[PDB]
Coordinates of C-alpha atoms and ligand atoms in Angstrom, one line a residue:
Chain A
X1 CA 0.4 2.8 5.2
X2 CA -0.4 6.0 3.5
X3 CA 0.0 6.3 -0.3
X4 CA 1.6 9.6 -1.1
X5 CA -0.9 12.5 -1.4
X6 CA 0.6 13.1 -4.9
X7 CA -0.9 10.0 -6.3
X8 CA -4.5 11.4 -6.3
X9 CA -3.2 14.7 -8.0
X10 CA -1.0 12.8 -10.5
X11 CA -4.0 10.6 -11.5
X12 CA -6.3 13.6 -12.0
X13 CA -3.6 15.3 -14.1
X14 CA -3.1 12.3 -16.4
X15 CA -6.8 12.1 -16.9
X16 CA -7.2 15.8 -17.9
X17 CA -4.0 15.8 -20.0
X18 CA -5.7 13.1 -22.3
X19 CA -8.1 15.9 -23.5
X20 CA -5.3 18.5 -24.1
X21 CA -4.1 18.6 -27.8
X22 CA -1.3 21.0 -26.9
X23 CA 1.3 21.1 -24.1
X24 CA -0.1 22.4 -20.8
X25 CA 2.2 24.3 -18.3
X26 CA 2.2 23.4 -14.6
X27 CA 0.6 26.8 -13.7
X28 CA -2.4 26.0 -15.9
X29 CA -2.9 22.5 -14.3
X30 CA -2.5 24.1 -10.9
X31 CA -5.1 26.7 -11.6
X32 CA -7.7 24.2 -12.9
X33 CA -7.3 22.4 -9.5
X34 CA -6.8 25.6 -7.4
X35 CA -3.5 24.2 -5.9
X36 CA 0.0 25.5 -5.5
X37 CA 2.0 25.4 -8.8
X38 CA 5.1 24.3 -7.0
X39 CA 3.2 21.5 -5.3
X40 CA 1.7 20.2 -8.6
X41 CA 5.0 20.5 -10.5
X42 CA 6.8 18.1 -8.1
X43 CA 4.1 15.5 -8.9
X44 CA 4.4 16.1 -12.7
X45 CA 8.2 15.8 -12.3
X46 CA 7.7 12.4 -10.6
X47 CA 5.6 11.4 -13.7
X48 CA 8.3 12.8 -16.0
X49 CA 11.1 10.8 -14.1
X50 CA 9.1 7.6 -14.7
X51 CA 8.7 8.6 -18.4
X52 CA 4.9 9.0 -18.4
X53 CA 4.9 12.8 -19.2
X54 CA 7.5 15.2 -20.7
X55 CA 8.0 18.9 -20.4
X56 CA 8.0 20.6 -23.8
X57 CA 10.6 23.4 -23.6
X58 CA 10.2 26.8 -25.3
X59 CA 7.2 28.5 -26.7
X60 CA 3.7 26.8 -26.4
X61 CA 5.6 24.6 -23.9
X62 CA 4.4 22.5 -21.0
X63 CA 3.5 18.9 -20.1
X64 CA 2.4 16.2 -22.6
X65 CA 1.7 12.5 -22.1
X66 CA 4.6 10.6 -23.6
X67 CA 2.4 7.8 -24.7
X68 CA -1.3 7.1 -25.2
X69 CA -3.6 7.0 -22.1
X70 CA -4.4 3.3 -22.9
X71 CA -0.7 2.5 -22.2
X72 CA -0.6 4.3 -18.8
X73 CA -1.8 1.9 -16.0
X74 CA -2.8 3.1 -12.5
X75 CA 0.1 1.0 -11.3
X76 CA 2.5 3.1 -13.5
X77 CA 1.4 6.3 -11.9
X78 CA 1.3 4.9 -8.3
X79 CA 4.9 3.6 -8.7
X80 CA 6.1 6.9 -10.3
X81 CA 4.8 9.0 -7.4
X82 CA 4.6 6.7 -4.3
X83 CA 7.6 4.6 -5.3
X84 CA 8.2 1.2 -6.8
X85 CA 8.8 -1.0 -3.7
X86 CA 6.2 -3.5 -2.5
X87 CA 4.4 -2.8 0.8
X88 CA 6.1 -5.9 2.4
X89 CA 9.8 -6.6 2.0
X90 CA 11.2 -9.8 3.7
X91 CA 14.5 -9.1 5.5
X92 CA 14.9 -12.9 6.1
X93 CA 14.4 -12.7 9.9
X94 CA 14.2 -16.6 9.9
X95 CA 18.0 -16.3 9.4
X96 CA 18.6 -14.3 12.5
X97 CA 18.6 -15.5 16.1
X98 CA 19.8 -18.7 17.9
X99 CA 17.4 -21.0 15.9
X100 CA 18.3 -19.4 12.5
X101 CA 17.8 -21.4 9.4
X102 CA 21.2 -21.6 7.6
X103 CA 21.1 -19.5 4.4
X104 CA 21.9 -22.9 2.6
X105 CA 18.5 -24.2 3.7
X106 CA 16.7 -21.0 2.5
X107 CA 16.4 -21.9 -1.3
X108 CA 12.6 -21.2 -1.2
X109 CA 11.0 -17.9 0.0
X110 CA 9.5 -18.0 3.5
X111 CA 5.8 -19.0 3.3
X112 CA 5.0 -15.8 5.3
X113 CA 6.8 -13.7 2.5
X114 CA 5.0 -15.7 -0.2
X115 CA 1.6 -15.0 1.4
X116 CA 2.4 -11.3 1.7
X117 CA 3.6 -11.5 -2.0
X118 CA 0.3 -13.0 -3.1
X119 CA -1.6 -10.0 -1.5
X120 CA 0.8 -7.5 -3.2
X121 CA 0.2 -9.3 -6.5
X122 CA -3.6 -8.8 -6.1
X123 CA -3.0 -5.1 -5.5
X124 CA -0.7 -4.8 -8.5
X125 CA -3.1 -6.9 -10.7
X126 CA -6.0 -4.5 -10.0
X127 CA -3.9 -1.4 -10.7
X128 CA -2.2 -2.8 -13.8
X129 CA -5.6 -3.8 -15.4
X130 CA -6.9 -0.2 -15.3
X131 CA -5.6 2.6 -17.5
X132 CA -5.9 6.4 -17.8
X133 CA -8.0 5.5 -20.8
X134 CA -10.5 3.5 -18.7
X135 CA -10.8 6.3 -16.2
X136 CA -11.6 8.7 -19.2
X137 CA -14.2 6.2 -20.4
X138 CA -15.9 6.1 -17.0
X139 CA -15.9 9.9 -16.8
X140 CA -17.4 10.2 -20.3
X141 CA -20.0 7.7 -19.1
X142 CA -20.9 9.5 -15.8
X143 CA -20.1 13.2 -16.6
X144 CA -21.1 13.0 -20.3
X145 CA -18.9 13.2 -23.4
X146 CA -18.5 17.1 -23.4
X147 CA -16.9 17.2 -19.9
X148 CA -13.3 16.3 -20.5
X149 CA -13.0 18.0 -24.0
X150 CA -14.3 21.1 -22.2
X151 CA -11.6 20.8 -19.5
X152 CA -9.1 20.1 -22.3
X153 CA -10.1 23.3 -24.1
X154 CA -9.8 25.3 -20.8
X155 CA -6.3 23.8 -20.3
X156 CA -5.0 24.6 -23.8
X157 CA -6.7 28.0 -24.2
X158 CA -4.5 31.0 -25.2
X159 CA -5.2 34.6 -24.6
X160 CA -8.9 33.8 -24.1
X161 CA -7.9 32.3 -20.7
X162 CA -7.9 35.8 -19.3
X163 CA -11.5 36.8 -20.5
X164 CA -14.0 34.5 -18.7
Chain B
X1 CA 4.6 2.2 -0.4
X2 CA 5.8 0.6 2.9
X3 CA 4.5 -1.3 5.9
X4 CA 6.3 -1.2 9.3
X5 CA 9.1 -3.8 9.8
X6 CA 7.1 -4.9 12.8
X7 CA 4.8 -6.8 10.3
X8 CA 7.3 -9.5 9.5
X9 CA 8.3 -10.0 13.1
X10 CA 4.6 -10.0 14.2
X11 CA 3.6 -12.7 11.7
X12 CA 6.6 -14.9 12.7
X13 CA 5.6 -14.3 16.3
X14 CA 1.9 -15.5 15.7
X15 CA 3.2 -18.6 13.8
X16 CA 5.6 -19.7 16.6
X17 CA 3.2 -19.0 19.5
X18 CA 0.8 -21.6 17.9
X19 CA 3.5 -24.2 18.8
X20 CA 4.0 -23.1 22.4
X21 CA 2.1 -25.2 25.0
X22 CA 2.7 -22.8 28.0
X23 CA 3.0 -19.0 28.1
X24 CA 6.2 -17.7 26.5
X25 CA 8.4 -15.5 28.6
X26 CA 9.1 -12.1 27.1
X27 CA 12.9 -12.6 27.3
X28 CA 12.7 -15.9 25.2
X29 CA 10.3 -14.3 22.7
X30 CA 12.7 -11.3 22.2
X31 CA 15.7 -13.7 21.9
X32 CA 14.1 -15.8 19.1
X33 CA 14.9 -13.3 16.4
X34 CA 17.4 -11.2 18.5
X35 CA 15.3 -8.0 19.1
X36 CA 15.6 -5.7 22.1
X37 CA 13.0 -5.8 25.0
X38 CA 11.9 -2.3 23.8
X39 CA 11.2 -3.6 20.3
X40 CA 9.4 -6.6 21.7
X41 CA 7.2 -4.4 24.0
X42 CA 6.1 -2.3 21.1
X43 CA 5.1 -5.3 18.9
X44 CA 3.3 -7.0 21.8
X45 CA 1.5 -3.7 22.7
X46 CA 0.2 -3.8 19.0
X47 CA -0.8 -7.5 19.2
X48 CA -2.4 -6.9 22.5
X49 CA -4.4 -3.8 21.4
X50 CA -5.7 -5.9 18.5
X51 CA -6.8 -8.8 20.9
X52 CA -4.4 -11.3 19.3
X53 CA -1.8 -11.9 22.1
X54 CA -2.4 -11.8 25.8
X55 CA -0.1 -11.6 28.8
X56 CA -0.6 -14.2 31.6
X57 CA 0.9 -13.0 34.9
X58 CA 2.7 -15.2 37.5
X59 CA 5.9 -17.1 38.0
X60 CA 5.5 -19.3 34.8
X61 CA 4.0 -16.3 33.0
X62 CA 4.3 -15.1 29.4
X63 CA 2.5 -14.5 26.1
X64 CA -0.1 -16.7 24.6
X65 CA -2.4 -16.4 21.5
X66 CA -5.9 -15.3 22.5
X67 CA -7.6 -17.5 19.9
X68 CA -6.8 -20.4 17.6
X69 CA -4.5 -20.0 14.6
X70 CA -7.6 -20.8 12.4
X71 CA -9.3 -17.5 13.6
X72 CA -6.4 -15.2 13.0
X73 CA -6.0 -13.8 9.5
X74 CA -2.9 -12.1 8.0
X75 CA -5.1 -9.0 7.7
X76 CA -5.7 -9.1 11.5
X77 CA -1.9 -9.1 12.1
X78 CA -1.1 -6.5 9.4
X79 CA -3.7 -4.1 10.7
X80 CA -2.6 -4.8 14.3
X81 CA 0.9 -3.5 13.6
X82 CA 0.3 -1.0 10.6
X83 CA -3.1 0.1 11.6
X84 CA -6.5 -0.1 9.8
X85 CA -6.2 3.2 7.8
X86 CA -7.0 3.2 4.1
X87 CA -3.7 3.7 2.2
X88 CA -5.5 5.8 -0.5
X89 CA -7.4 8.8 0.9
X90 CA -9.6 10.8 -1.6
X91 CA -9.5 14.6 -0.7
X92 CA -12.3 15.5 -3.2
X93 CA -10.0 17.5 -5.5
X94 CA -12.6 17.3 -8.2
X95 CA -14.5 19.8 -6.1
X96 CA -11.8 22.4 -6.4
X97 CA -11.2 25.2 -8.9
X98 CA -13.2 27.1 -11.6
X99 CA -14.6 23.9 -13.2
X100 CA -15.5 22.2 -9.9
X101 CA -17.9 19.3 -9.9
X102 CA -20.8 20.8 -7.8
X103 CA -21.4 18.9 -4.4
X104 CA -24.8 17.8 -5.7
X105 CA -23.2 15.9 -8.6
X106 CA -20.8 14.1 -6.1
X107 CA -23.3 11.5 -4.8
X108 CA -20.9 8.7 -5.9
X109 CA -17.2 8.5 -5.3
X110 CA -14.8 9.9 -7.9
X111 CA -14.0 7.2 -10.6
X112 CA -10.3 7.5 -9.7
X113 CA -11.1 6.9 -6.0
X114 CA -13.2 3.9 -6.9
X115 CA -10.4 2.3 -8.9
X116 CA -7.9 2.9 -6.1
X117 CA -10.3 1.8 -3.3
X118 CA -11.0 -1.4 -5.4
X119 CA -7.3 -2.3 -5.7
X120 CA -6.8 -1.8 -2.0
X121 CA -9.8 -4.0 -1.3
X122 CA -8.2 -6.8 -3.4
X123 CA -5.1 -6.6 -1.2
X124 CA -7.3 -6.7 2.0
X125 CA -9.4 -9.6 0.7
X126 CA -6.2 -11.6 -0.1
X127 CA -4.8 -11.0 3.4
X128 CA -8.2 -11.8 5.0
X129 CA -8.5 -15.2 3.1
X130 CA -5.3 -16.6 4.7
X131 CA -4.9 -17.5 8.3
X132 CA -2.0 -18.1 10.7
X133 CA -3.2 -21.8 10.6
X134 CA -2.6 -22.0 6.8
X135 CA 0.9 -20.7 7.3
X136 CA 1.5 -23.2 10.2
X137 CA 0.3 -26.0 7.8
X138 CA 2.6 -24.7 5.0
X139 CA 5.6 -24.7 7.4
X140 CA 4.8 -28.2 8.6
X141 CA 4.7 -29.3 5.0
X142 CA 8.0 -27.6 3.8
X143 CA 10.2 -27.5 7.0
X144 CA 8.8 -30.8 8.3
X145 CA 6.3 -31.7 11.2
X146 CA 9.1 -31.3 13.9
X147 CA 10.3 -27.7 13.0
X148 CA 7.6 -25.6 14.8
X149 CA 7.3 -28.0 17.8
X150 CA 11.1 -27.7 18.2
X151 CA 10.7 -23.9 18.3
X152 CA 7.8 -24.0 20.8
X153 CA 9.8 -26.4 23.1
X154 CA 12.8 -23.9 22.9
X155 CA 10.5 -20.9 23.7
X156 CA 9.0 -22.5 26.9
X157 CA 12.0 -24.6 28.3
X158 CA 12.4 -23.6 32.0
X159 CA 16.2 -23.2 32.1
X160 CA 18.9 -21.9 29.6
Ligands
FES201 S1 11.7 -14.7 6.9 FE1 10.8 -12.8 6.1 S2 8.7 -13.2 6.1 FE2 9.6 -15.0 7.1
FES202 S1 -11.5 13.5 -6.3 FE1 -10.1 12.1 -5.1 S2 -9.5 10.6 -6.5 FE2 -10.7 12.0 -7.8
CL203 CL1 -19.5 5.3 -5.2

């Protein structure tokens, strides 16, 4: 397996967007991270299709979180970018072949499917129990409390952006 | 995210090979769930590379598990087919751009990478805590003690 490369970018974007008190265009996000604007926009559009961000149209426009960081799980972002399917999907192979279990006798899920299900559930539990807000709190703890507000200022800056 | 389809087949394979008392001919093993010989060869290459299934040559030849069901975890089989690669790869994007974290302040992993590595490790830990023997016992419990022996007898029977 390989999680989509976009997951890492999308997570970083959600975290910095928490410090932005105005909409932030894609180009500004891309410049912070020194990455292709068109690359980063595709990831932001994934977040937007999943309802986690929205593109403010018109003047002073750009991306905003559509709900508070504390209501955005890592699982939300991963599914938005990498896709909602579980890693393992049972195609009922016990029903194919010359010893096939009749579908009438397959009321319960295959024990193999259930065991893979249990593992998926552990993955989802760990991602669901952590939010953008928790990542922000770890950053404040490790980088200090001025780090993310400083990034946020840089992201929302107007004309001063061109005089560093 | 998505594992290979080989994973479902491979886990079923390891379960039924526990019930076989002789080597299982390639043709019968392929027949069990109607897959082509090419498809079989690929999965058995993977299980062989991971040390889980062995070929025994000769006239009554075939495949056998290399070790008892109790010593084969779901993680062993999943990594045999899908590979051992971490699903989440950190590319140190925090070290890019005009407000880059300097390399000296990147002694520890990025908080984001830590959260993602942690979740992946919970998935691995769950797969590692369950064995092919636990699945065999659950099958015997739910399908009845004759189900798997019936399959193993079918796999090894000399004539068709
Ligand atoms: S029938 Fe799908 S995992 Fe067993
Ligand atoms: S630098 Fe890779 S996840 Fe933050
Ligand atoms: Cl670390």
